[PDB]
Ligand binder design. Structure first.
Ligand SMILES: O=C1NC2(CCCC2)Nc2ccccc21
Ligand SMILES: [Zn+2]
Ligand SMILES: [Zn+2]
Length: 583
């Protein structure tokens, strides 16, 4: 308890010595409270005017327009200790899984140089404002690195002074840049060296991209076995047990020297003991602590969520196959049965899964998996939107399975070749492209973000009539040489380029596509198919509405409206790449 966290707590106490008070009316029940201090501060979603002016029919669709407007009764709940049989299953599986992931990889420290390069190309490293303005300036100043050094040597000594979380759909634990550095130095290798690539982890999809995820699900569907299960966990990050954090820490068993000590300190001092500052309007700042749940950098969180989800799903597969009888206790001969299953078939069983952090698809050996719920529930990985002991409902067709907010279509080109394409309800896609985050956007910066959405649509969602038309309109309305941008950048964004989008389409879908045997390039956008018109409507198309027909017919007028706002620049007309504007 206070031996490991007190020092961090002590230090915050003194910087607000004028304000410290143990509030008697504190709302915490599962979080250990410690004190409050005085602050007074808050980032709403702003509309992208370039995208909205070129998507007029959606101005009267509430599912789009409501997205731009506007549970902590789940962070403040508790998870029970798993039974002894469950703890044994997790420990054997985790031991086995780090060894498999480690066979073709070497753990190593990430460098100041690597960290500096990341900051100088705008990645989301979840850091706070204070002594320097931005991340770019702290990294170019030697004083920073001396603070990093002090903390670094405190960790080698097994103590922590400044590694404190600041809490703020999605929960992010902002730390100061220095604490983020030390996390990256010790555990960055998991992402930097692709430990959760499909080649390395067999279940993982790190670095894949939406042009690959549908082909991966179709390959899983080809295995003999039962339904495809895609059960979401209710509040995954809140269900990570202290036993989970201890099995994750076993990656340190594969390390040596300074690295092993620096990694052991991240896990012991920051992950398995947390210090958090939270804004309460009663506006004060509460200093709360707890031992369990996930609270790490976004990138480390993705890797360890993937690890622990692979572990949980192998165990659910073991339960379905009758490898063990009860979670109450594993007998000595069950332990050897479990180890032997892992050695014998473990890699085959990993290949039956697609796992992206808390998100999974599993094609088990048979449908016994559906009612194999004892280990899953006892590990705390309770399924969302279904009663605890009700058997899972599986999917009979890989094209129906949800994964990473998409489903996937099989789309046959006029020349017979097969595309497996990503898809989701079109209101969601249009609604997101109409939103920006943060202040100080110039018209040029707003235009270049619209262009990023348009090029993503061309590459990933070309098969949706409305999005190929709107993408061509936005690319016609934004100056041809202006570079697409994002302010927040495990997937490949091939659309972030000033290269011709037909050339990028050929590279992604034909040349580098390992599922496409015939490498014959496509010569025009007219060779690139759409979904069936009825399927396009099913997935949210406005094709057939009077509003949509008027928009398509008069698109030049909309393009010209945006060009007139941006001013006298060099523009290209991309509409004649479409049959209906080609005379
Ligand atoms: O566990 C995670 N789940 C998803 C949702 C589906 C893709 C991965 N997102 C994440 C992003 C950062 C960190 C963790 C996660
Ligand atoms: Zn620290
Ligand atoms: Zn669809």
């Amino acid at each position: 308890n206070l031996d490991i966290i007190g020092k961090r707590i002590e230090k915050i106490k003194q910087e607000h010595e004028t304000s410290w008070h143990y509030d008697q009316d504190h709302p915490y029940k599962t979080w250990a409270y410690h004190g409050s201090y005085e602050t007074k501060q808050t980032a709403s979603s702003m509309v992208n005017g370039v995208v909205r002016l070129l998507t007029k029919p959606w101005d009267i669709i509430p599912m789009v327009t409501q997205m731009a407007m506007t549970f902590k009764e789940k962070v403040d709940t508790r998870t029970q200790e798993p039974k002894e049989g469950t703890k044994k299953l997790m420990k054997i599986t985790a031991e086995w899984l780090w060894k498999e992931l480690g066979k073709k990889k070497t753990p190593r420290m990430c460098t100041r140089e690597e960290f500096t390069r990341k900051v100088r190309s705008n990645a989301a490293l979840g850091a706070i404002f204070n002594k320097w303005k931005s991340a770019r300036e702290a990294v170019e100043d030697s004083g920073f690195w001396e603070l990093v050094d002090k903390e670094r040597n405190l960790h080698l000594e097994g103590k922590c002074e400044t590694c404190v979380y600041n809490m703020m759909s999605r929960a992010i634990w902002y730390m100061w840049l220095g604490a983020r550095f030390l996390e990256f130095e010790a555990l960055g290798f998991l992402n930097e060296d692709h430990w959760f690539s499909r080649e390395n982890s067999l279940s993982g999809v790190e670095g894949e991209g939406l042009h690959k995820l549908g082909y991966i699900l179709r390959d899983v569907s080809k295995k003999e076995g039962g339904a495809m299960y895609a059960d979401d966990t209710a509040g995954w990050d809140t269900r990570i047990t202290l036993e989970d954090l201890k099995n994750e820490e076993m990656v340190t068993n594969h390390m040596e020297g300074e690295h092993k000590k620096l990694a052991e300190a991240i896990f012991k001092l920051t992950y398995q003991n947390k210090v958090v500052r939270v804004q309460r309007p009663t506006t004060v700042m509460d200093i709360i602590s707890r031992r369990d749940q996930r609270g790490s950098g976004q990138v480390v969180t993705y890797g360890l969520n993937t690890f622990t989800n692979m572990e949980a799903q192998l165990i659910r597969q073991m339960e379905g196959e009758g490898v063990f009888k009860s979670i109450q206790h594993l007998t000595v001969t069950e332990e050897i049965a479990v180890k032997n299953w892992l050695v014998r078939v473990g890699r085959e069983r990993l290949s039956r899964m697609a796992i992206s952090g808390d998100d999974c698809v599993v094609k088990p050996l048979d449908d016994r998996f559906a009612s194999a719920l004892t280990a899953l529930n006892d590990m705390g990985k309770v399924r969302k939107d279904i009663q605890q002991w009700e058997p899972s409902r599986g999917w009979n067709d890989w094209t129906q399975v949800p994964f990473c907010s998409h489903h996937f279509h099989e789309l046959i080109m006029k020349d017979g070749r097969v595309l497996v394409v990503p898809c989701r309800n079109q209101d969601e896609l249009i609604g997101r492209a109409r939103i920006s985050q943060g202040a100080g956007w110039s018209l040029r910066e707003t235009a270049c973000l619209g262009k990023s959405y348009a090029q993503m649509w061309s590459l990933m969602y070309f098969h949706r009539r409305d999005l190929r038309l709107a993408a061509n309109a936005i690319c016609s309305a934004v100056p041809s040489h202006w570079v697409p941008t994002s302010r927040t950048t495990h997937a490949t964004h091939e659309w972030m380029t000033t290269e011709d989008m037909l050339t990028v389409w050929n590279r992604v879908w034909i040349q580098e596509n390992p599922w496409m045997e015939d490498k014959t390039p496509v010569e025009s956008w007219e060779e690139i198919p759409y979904l069936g018109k009825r399927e396009d409507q099913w997935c949210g198309s406005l094709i057939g509405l009077t509003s949509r027909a008027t928009w398509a017919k008069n698109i030049q007028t909309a393009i010209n409206q945006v060009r007139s706002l941006i001013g006298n620049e060099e523009y290209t007309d991309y509409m004649p790449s479409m049959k209906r504007f080609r005379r």
